[PDB]
Paper text:
We set out to design proteins that can switch between two well-defined and fully structured conformations. We reasoned that these goals could be collectively achieved with a “hinge”-like design in which two rigid domains move relative to each other while remaining individually folded. The hinge amplifies small local structural and chemical changes to achieve large global changes while the chemical environment for most residues remains similar throughout the conformational change, avoiding the need for global unfolding. Designing one of the resulting conformations to bind to a target effector couples the conformational equilibrium with target binding.
To explore whether peptide-responsive hinges could be turned into protein-responsive hinges, we used inpainting with RoseTTAFold to add two additional helices to a validated effector peptide, resulting in fully structured 3-helix bundles (3hb). For nine of our validated hinges we designed and experimentally characterized these effector proteins using SEC. Hinge-3hb binding was tested qualitatively by SEC and, for hinges which had a corresponding FRET construct, quantitatively with the FRET-labeled variant, and DEER was used in addition to FRET to confirm that 3hb binding caused the same conformational change as effector peptide binding. For two designs, 3hb05 and [name], we obtained crystal structures that agreed well with the design models, indicating that the three-helix bundles are fully structured in isolation. The 3hb approach was able to rescue designs for which the peptide alone or the hinge-peptide complex had shown the tendency to form higher-order oligomers.
Numbering used by the authors:
A (entry chain A), B (entry chain B): 2 to 97
């Protein structure tokens, strides 16, 4: 089970960093004012999907914490939550 | 100055993720014995360097917080500490 939590955590690290990248692209986009509707909607789309992946990873970590209850499942839950939060920020930054 | 903290933050996100990639490689290698002495010493060297980079970004964040106790500078210091900590885990894993 600790190996399942390790794959959950590492997958969360991936979606966090990718949300971090998308958020930066969206923040630079609002400050630049580049109203490339294709680019604005593409970032919005990939940020929305990244969030749904983060929510799925989140609830899967909750399930892996119902069972067991170890620190490795606990850390995998925080990393999923952070990824969810970074994705919601990339979301709201893409709306503008 | 708030743009400087954004750059110090984004740089800390890169160092964090790279420490996450290095650490996973070292744990996977410590678990098995596949790591050659070249590779084991290579992961350690880039992790040690990555650690020093994370200490420099941390201290630069402590300076930025000293100059202005802004929330943007605060989160950048948190991200640098996180990168520092992830780098140190990559160090200890590469020792084995």
């Amino acid at each position: 089970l600790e190996e399942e939590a390790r794959e959950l955590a590492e997958e969360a690290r991936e979606v966090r960093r990718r949300a971090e990248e998308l958020r930066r692209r969206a923040e630079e986009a609002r400050e630049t004012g580049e109203a490339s509707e294709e680019h604005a909607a593409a970032l919005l789309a990939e940020a929305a999907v990244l969030e749904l992946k983060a929510v799925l990873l989140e609830l899967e970590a909750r399930r892996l914490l119902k069972e067991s209850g170890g620190e490795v499942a606990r850390e995998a839950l925080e990393l999923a939550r952070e990824a969810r939060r970074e994705a919601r920020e990339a979301l709201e930054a893409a709306e503008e």
